[PDB]
Design a protein around this ligand. Structure first.
Ligand code: CLA
Ligand code: CLA
Ligand code: CLA
Ligand code: CLA
Ligand code: CLA
Ligand code: CLA
Ligand code: CLA
Ligand code: CLA
Ligand SMILES: CC1=C(C#C/C(C)=C/C=C/C(C)=C/C=C/C=C(C)/C=C/C=C(C)/C=C/[C@@]23O[C@]2(C)C[C@@H](O)CC3(C)C)C(C)(C)C[C@H](O)C1
Ligand SMILES: CC1=C(C#C/C(C)=C/C=C/C(C)=C/C=C/C=C(C)/C=C/C=C(C)/C=C/[C@@]23O[C@]2(C)C[C@@H](O)CC3(C)C)C(C)(C)C[C@H](O)C1
Ligand code: SF4
Ligand code: SF4
Lengths: 199, 217, 166, 62, 80, 73, 37
């Protein structure tokens, strides 16, 4: 079986039934098969939020460079909403939001139902069964294609990449003090002397 | 190097009466040395065995970690603030930071107590798993010789090679323990780096000794 | 370094006021005696100690309040960041070592005599050899503590613990 | 069945002082009319100051 | 009046009966214990509530039990 | 006993730093701790539509009111 | 003396002795190294 390290033997509980299995579980976190189904949902979920979060974090830089709008930087938006107004796509008549606590309240109030419904497996107040959803289909799959194990592996794989990417964005922004594409531009200019190990 | 009743012993050929009875050559590094009788109780002997291996393995990483940043600063031009082992530590004091490989984008740690508290918490977990012999990383095969995740290359699979390598481990461990005790006493007496101590005795085999410091006591 | 609105005792005027006030009292008492007499010598020893003590507090980075008296810092983060760990944090470790020692010695002696014929006679007449042995072997008490904890020999099981009608 | 004279039992009568504690069996009565046939002796005296008590079989774990 | 009740854990040692200062308890025949007697409380109109019987009883949680109730001149121990 | 023996400097006088921290976060500037409402640069302070803050800070840094009294040993 | 040491082993004697030593030690430390705050 393909594994994360040359020759490395898989655990007993990681067999290969589920997409993305490369026998990686040193810390033995999926011994309990009850916790493994939750973790599997959490992995895909974390993945999908990372992918959307990556795209949404590149969008200010791209829209800046292509002359679409002067959006704030991803690490500045909460500061902008806190001190001034957050105007959608530059346009001061769009959204124009000014108070960070009302944004947070709204975020809990909108995402609460949606999150409960996701967990419950339906638009109801009690879970249908003891199983996580993860691949709903129906309205969430308008193009009528999917849930094949190859596509699932494609989701898992891009997800994992985006989560490592997102960690990148956080650390980069702290260290370099500038935007992510700016960091790419810096490395592409002079790679021997615009990197981490050069000081 | 071996086990059994006719293994190497600590007084060499003249080691007839020099071996206590309870040391029957079952465990690695038995040269029949126990002159204070500490291991006469066999539960105490299991304890001490684990302790000798814990001190040893820590001593090995220690001596490597006390020498490596000095060597990196000497050989290569890595600009450590105070690269000596007994002077490292104070770097995080005052307003200074700790930068891995003297690169201020690497750890950039300035909070001593946050460092220490994280260490104690991590160790309280990992040492409690060690003592229990079961934890996240699995159940131990032997308390001192866990195996599993701890042996990823499978070098303990062969029984005879494992039996030898236990003797290699305990002998390197003992040396490292004497090294570390060396480092401590050298710093306490000479006040200089241990690579400077070596350089001073390489330049001059003669007076540059412990018997240049002994007259001052 | 002045933190929390406090001044260092080394550069506090109220600190000096206090030292003056104590030394002046001692001078007044000395007026009554003769410069060579032994009460005089006693009051001089007292005054010496006093000035020494204030000097010590001055070169210890202690922090004075508006009253001019030293104040202790007990958050460990503040203590370690501003060099005040000797006020509470080191004493903590020191107390917790000695309290763990006393506990360990007491528990040990009790578990030892509990296997005797009349265990209650060994509580009112102390087995002094046994007690001294335990007192001196218990200097490494975290060995026993972490062993008992991790193994499971620290706690009695609930089934063996007497309890009321609940 | 009864415990053997000299065996060790654990009391399971909740109102007793010796609940969850271990005692020695001294005597078992064999008549069926007796309501508490087993005599148990304990090391720890109760608040009354007695150390012995009669028990039924359904109040002991042996 | 107070209420004195006897429960089936009695072992017929007669100690409660001996203890009682107002003759409330007596021993009647029974087959539930080796001594073949149980305590009983016919004259509870004469019980003063002293609880001497419960102090005498040697069973683990007493077999005799006095529940104090309504006072009368008899139970209140009055010579007036 | 320290007061009785004429040595008030040997009292144990622990500062209440955790309550002084909370007071600092509410806007008291007597402890020089500069956090939350006592820092000018914080999000909590610079919250645009705060607007209760000038009144509040006037009140909390006035000795006459009992709005968070100063505290010590 | 044949049971005198057993008398000295009884709880109030051992207590008086132990407190006396422990007290004496703390007094002597507070003679040599006074005024630790
Ligand atoms: C997890 C994903 C995620 C999150 C939390 C955000 C969050 C945000 N976006 Mg981003 N965005 C994202 C993904 C995300 N985005 C993606 C995937 C795209 C490409 C479609 C965009 C394209 C985008 C644009 C063009 C703009 C934002 C803007 C914003 C900010 C205001 C949102 C608003 O006013 O909505 C209004 C609500 C609805 C439209 C419904 C907010 C910080 C605005 C901003 O000020 O930029 C910093 C803005 O102009 N986003
Ligand atoms: C590489 C990324 C990737 C891949 C291969 C998949 C693959 C899959 N998804 Mg997943 N998904 C993703 C990202 C991805 N998803 C993200 C970011 C989210 C959060 C919005 C989700 C949330 C999600 C839900 C709720 C569901 C799926 C389902 C599925 C399965 C069927 C649909 C499909 O074939 O999508 C293929 C994906 C692509 C061809 C990528 C399209 C690229 C877009 C167009 C780029 C533009 C994005 C835009 C700016 C963002 C606006 C918001 C299939 C396994 C469905 C399922 O299992 O039902 C049977 C299902 O119900 N996914
Ligand atoms: C030939 C005579 C001889 C003598 C006098 C000694 C003496 C000693 N050896 Mg021994 N040793 C010998 C031969 C001898 N060795 C031989 C032939 C071998 C096999 C090479 C060893 C293997 C050996 C080991 C592995 C160790 C000793 C150690 C010791 C020391 C024990 C510590 C002490 O103070 O007593 C002592 C100096 C111990 C030591 O170094 O303690 C400091 C120790 O670990 N010896
Ligand atoms: C007991 C083993 C041990 C311990 C406790 C230390 C402790 C330390 N090392 Mg050392 N080191 C060791 C063994 C050890 N080392 C070994 C075996 C090597 C060879 C691989 C090194 C090579 C090394 C280098 C190159 C550097 C250190 C550095 C340090 C310091 C900062 C570490 C850090 O930032 O975490 C890092 C956090 C994670 C790994 C997570 C700290 C004093 C740094 C320093 O500044 O020392 C003066 C530093 O630059 N160590
Ligand atoms: C759960 C997390 C965890 C973590 C982070 C550690 C980490 C550590 N263990 Mg511990 N340990 C653990 C759980 C863990 N252990 C468990 C579950 C057991 C089995 C019961 C042990 C039994 C064990 C032993 C017996 C020893 C360690 C040692 C170590 C150190 C070196 C490991 C090594 O040699 O790598 C291989 C590459 C390292 C600090 C060793 C050590 O610290 O000596 C210096 C050591 O001797 N571990
Ligand atoms: C029991 C309650 C308690 C409370 C209310 C505090 C409160 C505080 N701690 Mg302390 N701390 C405590 C226990 C506590 N600590 C404990 C148990 C430890 C581990 C020993 C620490 C270790 C600690 C560190 C390492 C730091 C603080 C710091 C602080 C300040 C936090 C400032 C901030 O959030 O940025 C604040 C006064 C920070 C500070 O400002 O100190 C200078 C800081 O760096 N604390
Ligand atoms: C072996 C002796 C010993 C040990 C290990 C403990 C341990 C404990 N006691 Mg207990 N206790 C003891 C003796 C001991 N006690 C004695 C002698 C008394 C009567 C005064 C008590 C009265 C007592 C009360 C009222 C309470 C505790 C509580 C506790 C628990 C919390 C810590 C504490 O409150 O300390 C406080 C300890 C004391 C107030 C007593 C001082 C104990 C002395 C200083 C040490 C033992 C002296 C002994 C003579 C040593 C002889 C050893 C020698 C022969 C080798 C902890 C389990 C508390 C608890 O239940 O926590 C949940 C609690 O409320 N203890
Ligand atoms: C209950 C809480 C309490 C606490 C925390 C203190 C704490 C203190 N008292 Mg106070 N005191 C108290 C109650 C308390 N006392 C009571 C009830 C009285 C009235 C009887 C006093 C009367 C008193 C006087 C008169 C004096 C103190 C002194 C002290 C200081 C002790 C210096 C010392 O001897 O350390 C050194 C002792 C050790 C290091 C113990 C050694 C134990 C072993 C050998 C160490 C093992 C570690 C490994 C210390 C700050 C003295 C002082 O100078 O304060 C400034 C002092 O003169 N106390
Ligand atoms: C698996 C395993 C192990 C593991 C592991 C590892 C490496 C796990 C790591 C996980 C990792 C790295 C998870 C990251 C998540 C990132 C997310 C969800 C980001 C969302 C981000 C979003 C939704 C961002 C939104 C916004 O940015 C937008 C779009 C615009 C901004 O203006 C505003 C904000 C910022 C709000 C062990 C422990 C090694 C051993 C064990 O045995 C087995
Ligand atoms: C066997 C026996 C006997 C014996 C014996 C003998 C000889 C015992 C000797 C034991 C001995 C000598 C044991 C030393 C251990 C040293 C260790 C663990 C070092 C770790 C070091 C570490 C983990 C850390 C190092 C550093 O933190 C430092 C210091 C500073 C930092 O800048 C850098 C780092 C973090 C890297 C008797 C008593 C003679 C007779 C009896 O009958 C039988
Ligand atoms: S309470 Fe007193 S009077 Fe009443 S029955 Fe008991 S012993 Fe007799
Ligand atoms: S009630 Fe108690 S005291 Fe009275 S006879 Fe029965 S066992 Fe004995």
């Amino acid at each position: 079986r393909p594994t994360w390290f040359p020759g490395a033997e898989a655990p007993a509980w990681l067999t290969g039934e589920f997409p993305g299995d490369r026998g990686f579980d040193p810390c033995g976190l999926a011994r309990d098969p009850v916790d493994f189904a939750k973790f599997r949902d959490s992995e895909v979920f974390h993945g999908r939020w990372a992918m959307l979060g990556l795209v949404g974090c590149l969008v200010p830089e791209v829209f800046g460079n292509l002359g679409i709008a002067q959006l704030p930087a991803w690490y500045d938006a909460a500061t902008v909403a806190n001190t001034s107004n957050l105007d959608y796509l530059g346009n001061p008549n769009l959204v124009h939001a000014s108070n960070v606590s009302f944004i947070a309240l709204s975020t809990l109030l909108l995402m609460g139902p949606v999150e409960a419904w996701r967990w419950n497996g339906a638009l109801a107040s009690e879970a249908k069964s003891a199983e996580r959803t993860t691949y709903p289909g129906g309205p969430f799959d308008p193009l009528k294609l999917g849930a094949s194990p190859e596509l699932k592996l494609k989701e898992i794989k891009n997800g994992r990449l985006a989560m490592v990417g997102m960690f990148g964005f956080w650390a980069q922004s702290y260290v370099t003090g500038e935007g992510p594409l700016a960091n790419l531009a810096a490395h592409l200019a002079d790679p021997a002397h615009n990197n981490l190990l050069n000081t | 190097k071996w086990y059994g009743p006719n293994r190497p012993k600590w007084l060499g050929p003249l080691s007839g009466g020099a071996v206590p009875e309870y040391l029957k050559g079952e465990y690695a590094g038995d040269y029949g040395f126990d002159t204070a009788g500490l291991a006469a109780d066999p539960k105490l002997f299991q304890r001490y065995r684990d302790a000798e291996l814990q001190n040893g393995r820590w001593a090995m990483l220690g001596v490597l970690g006390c020498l490596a940043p000095e060597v990196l600063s000497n050989v290569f031009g890595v600009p450590y603030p105070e690269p000596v082992w007994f002077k490292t530590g104070a770097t995080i004091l005052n307003g200074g930071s700790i930068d891995y490989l003297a690169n201020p984008k690497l750890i950039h740690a300035s909070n001593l107590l946050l460092t220490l508290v994280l260490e104690l918490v991590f160790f309280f977990a990992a040492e409690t798993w060690r003592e229990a012999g079961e934890g996240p990383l699995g159940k131990a095969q032997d308390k001192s010789y866990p195996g599993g995740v701890f042996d990823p290359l499978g070098l303990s699979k062969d029984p005879a090679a494992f039996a030898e390598a236990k003797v290699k481990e305990v002998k390197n461990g003992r040396l490292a323990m004497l090294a570390m005790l060396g480092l401590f006493v050298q710093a306490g007496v000479t006040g200089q780096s241990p690579l400077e101590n070596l350089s001073a005795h390489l330049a001059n085999p003669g007076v540059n000794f412990w018997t240049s410091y002994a007259p001052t006591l | 370094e002045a933190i929390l609105g406090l001044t260092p005792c080394a550069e506090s005027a109220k600190f000096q006021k206090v030292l003056t006030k104590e030394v002046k009292a001692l001078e007044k008492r000395e007026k009554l005696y003769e410069p060579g007499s032994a009460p005089f010598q006693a009051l001089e020893a007292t005054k010496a100690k006093t000035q020494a003590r204030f000097a010590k507090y001055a070169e210890s980075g202690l922090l004075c309040g508006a009253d001019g008296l030293p104040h202790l810092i007990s958050d460990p983060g503040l203590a370690v960041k501003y060099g005040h760990a000797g006020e509470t944090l080191i004493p903590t470790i020191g107390f917790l070592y000695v309290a763990g020692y006393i506990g360990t010695a007491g528990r040990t002696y009790l578990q030892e005599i509990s296997t005797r014929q009349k265990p209650t006679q060994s509580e009112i007449i102390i087995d002094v050899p046994l007690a001294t042995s335990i007192a001196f072997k218990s200097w490494d008490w975290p060995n026993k503590a972490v062993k008992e904890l991790a193994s499971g020999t620290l706690l009695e099981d609930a089934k063996n613990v007497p309890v009321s009608r609940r | 069945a009864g415990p053997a004279r000299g065996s060790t039992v654990k009391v399971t009568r909740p109102e007793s002082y010796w609940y969850n504690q271990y005692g020695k069996v001294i005597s078992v009565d064999e008549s069926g009319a007796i309501r508490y046939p087993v005599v148990v002796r304990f090391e720890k005296e109760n608040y009354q100051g007695v150390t012995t008590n009669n028990f039924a079989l359904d109040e002991l774990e042996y | 009046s107070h209420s004195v009740k006897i429960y089936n854990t009695c072992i017929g040692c007669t100690q409660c009966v001996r203890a009682c200062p107002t003759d409330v308890l007596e021993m009647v025949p029974w087959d539930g214990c080796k001594a073949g007697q149980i305590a009983s409380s016919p004259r509870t109109e004469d019980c003063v509530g002293c609880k001497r019987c419960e102090s005498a009883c040697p069973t683990d949680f007493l077999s005799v039990r006095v529940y104090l109730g309504s006072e009368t001149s008899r139970s209140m121990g009055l010579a007036y | 006993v320290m007061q009785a023996f004429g040595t008030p400097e040997k009292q144990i006088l622990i500062e209440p730093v955790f309550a002084q921290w909370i007071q600092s976060a509410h806007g008291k500037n007597i402890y020089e701790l500069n956090i939350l409402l006592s820092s000018d640069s914080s999000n909590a302070f610079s919250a645009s539509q705060a607007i209760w803050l000038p009144g509040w800070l006037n009140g909390i840094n006035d000795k006459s009111t009992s709005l968070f009294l100063q505290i010590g040993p | 003396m044949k049971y005198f040491t057993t008398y000295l082993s009884t709880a109030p004697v051992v207590a008086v002795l132990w407190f006396t030593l422990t007290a004496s030690l703390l007094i002597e430390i507070n003679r040599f190294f006074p005024d630790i705050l």
